[PDB]
Symmetry: D3
Subunit: 262 residues, 6 copies
């Protein structure tokens, strides 16, 4: 995601937004406020997060300032958001616009919310990070610990019931569905959550528990319970999971083939 | 659901409401506003939908005109709601009143909200339909794509975590529990979601993926991951699912027998 | 939980609040209003529940009086909340403070909301109870029927998607994760939901269906579908689940070992 | 105001609305919802009243049914609003559009809210009428008792601080400014408030107290304190007021000449 | 106002509240929450103030606690409220119930709000007192400096535009109408506001400016500008005011005779 | 007002905020969000206006961008606000802090809201301006037409009931109290509202009507009705007003002597 490519995803969002105002006069001012009035993705993201997260405790106007402070300090979060937008648009056939994730999709919203909380956590502002984690769980039904380390090009399609714990890692170009847990084991601190490598697809309802590897290009079948490491470019399925095949592609996250004969 | 039988469902709802208002002074005014003031199920329904889906982006008062416009153009939607209410009351032992689904049950609300989104989608108002889909996902935790084709006499019991994709079909007299996915596969458009035929029961947490058929009178056991077509009058269970038996009834959606040995 | 132990968990929460106010100025007035201004747990709980259960139909101020009346009639509900705070702090390595469950964790909030609903249900105020049940489902994504009998020292970790039905029993010192169903079967009323005995641990996404026992100190593996009774001190896993071993502790709810194999 | 002339006021409002929506993207959706979606003045009016009077005690959606019920039973109220709109547009040089009073002018809103309160009062719904009176006083700063009898073609320009008591009469084609009191005297019931006849203009801050007559075509100067009857076609001014002259027009309410030397 | 008389005004409010729930089913839960559920006037007052004053800055639940703390420390404020209620009921013929001021009348609400701010001011909590003064000005359109000293048996009828400054004093049994200013002069601190003695009636729009006496039993005519002391049992009127008569009663505040021939 | 004087009033406001946070813990996060988190007046103003102008039609976050665009185009509006803060602090003995006008005083809030409306009005965004005009009237009870030309160093003390019309002019260093009308005459447009020149003081409830001059350093007595021009350095009072004397200062707006006689 280069500076020029960033400006193209933003230009495509704007172009679409013009169409949308003309399609739905009841949302025209909504499209104007969220998209058309903004000159870059960062301003559109801070607007969305501020309004979605908002509460009596913390108004949208206050939140936006924290968000904008995060993005000034680490503008790469904006670029990660762009890659997440492209991932949804290319991988999800129900989404044919760049603007749709930004406008509507709770998984995209929760992902960008996590990035703010993560930045806050790393700055030492943990109380606020933990508040936001739990507000995002109630509001968007996605529960991501702010100490998790999550890359870019991530799709959280549908997203309700996703849980990602404190020591999890998710690398770039990972596709995760509703009700996926990357969960802990034990009652002690320490490394205890999954390590999800690049290219991995995880079907709806998968539980992956403990400090275990899911290697690059692996496919986790829907409804699996994964208790042991999954080798790269392998397909795991069942309760508990065992290796049952190998994906037909190097990066199953890009193709979303939900079959697990293989 | 004839026009006479509709008026009897409505008359029962009102009769229940009077008793409810006399017993719970904190909710007397809520019962009056939602039920005792309306002269038909349609008005009560637009009321409930407008109030529950209300947001700063679109207020109750605006939502309601959209709902009433849809009901005027396709009054069968109101009949469909009435059947959905009877489905819940007869199939769910936790419900002993026609008023309960209408007042409180988020799966019932999500289902009627889907109906409005589907009507909008079909008229060409896709942008509003997609907005409402995702509003419904955040508020009721049910994510139903508005292009899904869903019949009547449907129960969505508990409902949190339900996902029904763009090309799904659900025929009449189907019962579905919490965390059920009628999900897609692949990254291209076109039919890629299940077709659930009449009489089918789907237990909690079942995942049915792809353009596969679940035949009439079939039972899908809780926690199943169904990747292949399920023949009529069969029971499927497992990760991945296989045919394990046959239901004791012609329409397992009616009796809610969660056992799978058949 | 005695009166002096109650007062100490409260003292701990207050001390933690002082620090929290000092280190996050955006939240200072929040910590002050939730924690610092109160002289006991009960008063902090009513505050939290009032604000979290608040809606157009019932504002915080009116809810609070209901909570306070319940707590004056049954002070053991405050003590049960204490035990639930301890349960979380000791069992959940993501949690290192007494105040965290109270301030933030929706499973803890939903559990205490259920207590109020259960109290109302046993007073004959069933309409109010069912209304709160379904509100808690929409707002915290936890659906517990107020006639469920649930003990103390309970953790609902993450919690999204939890469903507990009408005739369920959960005894003391039980740990339950996201997307756990204690669910029914059949369309007739009467006893039909699980009896989960003391010390049980239930992992993510487990469905336990019917009026079946899960014996003391049992362990239910993540993703299991339990259709048959599970003996005391035994581990069940699979779809459908079978006995696969015995836990390494007497009360697996306290240790949270998600491994099954043993 | 015939039924043909009403439709022309409405058609002009809609024509204005289209231009307004094209010029101000932040308000495009507001114009659409308030004006362009309605097919008559009555729907637009119930919309505006429901939204503006909305409170936690009574929401917009509930207010609107009350308003629409009143308009169905006494459609002349809608004609009265249409005349009040023409009054403002023709008499107030700051208004050059029929849409302006309906969209923005709190004196216009307060006056139509009075009409609903008066209808309720007359049917026997006094408790609701008194609630709305005082809600209107807090929200629009106009306090009109619902038993007041107020005709049509009335302008309440600026309107803050207007008080019209229980037994007041205001005939057709009267114009009243900010901080005008049509007030009582004494501590007993019965007629004790002014009777303002047709054509009368009342300047800012005038106080008219007791059951006294202000005759047709009379002008009351700004700041007057009128304790005694004012003859038709006369001008009164002073503290206390005396007859100082005679107006230049037959109906000073039409021309708004604030000068008092006559 | 004795302890027994306090219990009688409260009993009358309760009796009326029963009638009202039966008269208006849309407000029945409102009457239940505000009046019927409370066992004394103090609890009903703290409820009303908390909900009316409420804002994003300070929620109703937080405010109620401050209010209740004020009333514990100085229960005489409750008794003053009772006398203010009786004053409205006896002096205002538009009000025939004890409950009406408590439920609806913004002047009564602003008066009781001032008592809280005044208690706060005297405790040294001036920042909060000044915040509430200005919130009451926006919300109820009454602007009373918290350092003002105001007695009991006060009626603020209609109340919009009332201003009472920092060094004002208002004794018991005073009746003040809309748009009355008890105002300052100069830009220096020090005594500079009116001293209104017992029994005084002040008509709508009167301005009384500077540190001047309005002696017991005096009558200030509507629309007067009073720049010099008014002797006891005298009637002042005009701009500027001069003595023009003497009231027909010892305590013109009780009779509300608005005439000023005398 | 130079750039260094601006920065000092800001420094004063911040220092005052530190103290205010320390002494009222309920408001600490409030003071922090309004004052402490900002680096300049302009940014604190946009925050305050966004939050105070916020509504369902236009949320705080969108309003704020409008305010910021106005301030970037015309930075002198920030400097005018500074001057207005000083005006209040120096002229109003109830005010001893720079932060008080900014945090609390609705006249100061309404004045800066007018500045935004005036800027929008001169950009051709007249519909938005008129919408904000009428919102400010409902919310702060101040009705200023956005085409009014108003200078800097203005105090609107108390402010409820102020009306300023379309063609009014208010020059620098003018002081105006509650219930002042600068009002029009006639039903034709064109110039028809007062021209209030530098240094004028206008007391409570004065009405000044028509396109008439009120000359520099004049004093308008409370309750006056001014229908004829008022020479520079002259005092007008009465209904209707006449010249009664000459003020004791050059700019009576600075000294606030409400006496008239001289």
């Amino acid at each position: 995601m280069s500076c020029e490519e960033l400006e193209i995803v933003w230009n495509n969002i704007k172009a679409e937004a013009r169409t949308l105002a003309d399609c739905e006069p009841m949302l025209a001012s909504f499209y104007h406020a969220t998209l058309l009035k903004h000159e870059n993705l960062g301003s559109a993201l801070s607007y969305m997060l501020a309004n979605k997260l908002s509460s009596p405790i913390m108004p949208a106007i206050a939140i936006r300032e924290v968000v904008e402070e995060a993005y000034a300090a680490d503008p790469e979060m904006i670029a990660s958001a762009a890659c997440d937008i492209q991932a949804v648009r290319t991988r999800d056939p129900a989404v044919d616009k760049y603007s749709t994730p930004l406008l509507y999709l709770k998984g995209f919203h929760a992902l960008q919310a996590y990035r703010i909380g993560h930045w806050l956590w790393n700055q030492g502002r943990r109380a606020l990070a933990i508040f936001l984690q739990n507000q995002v769980s109630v509001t968007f039904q996605v529960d991501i610990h702010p100490a998790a380390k999550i890359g870019r090009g991530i799709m959280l399609d549908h997203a309700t019931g996703i849980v990602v714990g404190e020591t999890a890692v998710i690398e770039n170009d990972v596709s995760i569905l509703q009700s996926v847990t990357l969960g802990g084991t034990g009652k002690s601190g320490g490394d205890r959550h999954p390590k999800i490598r690049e290219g991995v697809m995880i079907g709806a309802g998968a539980k992956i528990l403990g400090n275990i590897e899911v290697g690059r290009g692996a496919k986790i079948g829907a409804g699996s319970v994964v208790l042991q490491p999954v080798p790269p470019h392998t397909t795991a399925a069942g309760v508990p999971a065992r290796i049952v095949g190998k994906p037909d592609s190097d990066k199953p996250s890009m193709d979303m083939d939900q079959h697990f004969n293989g």
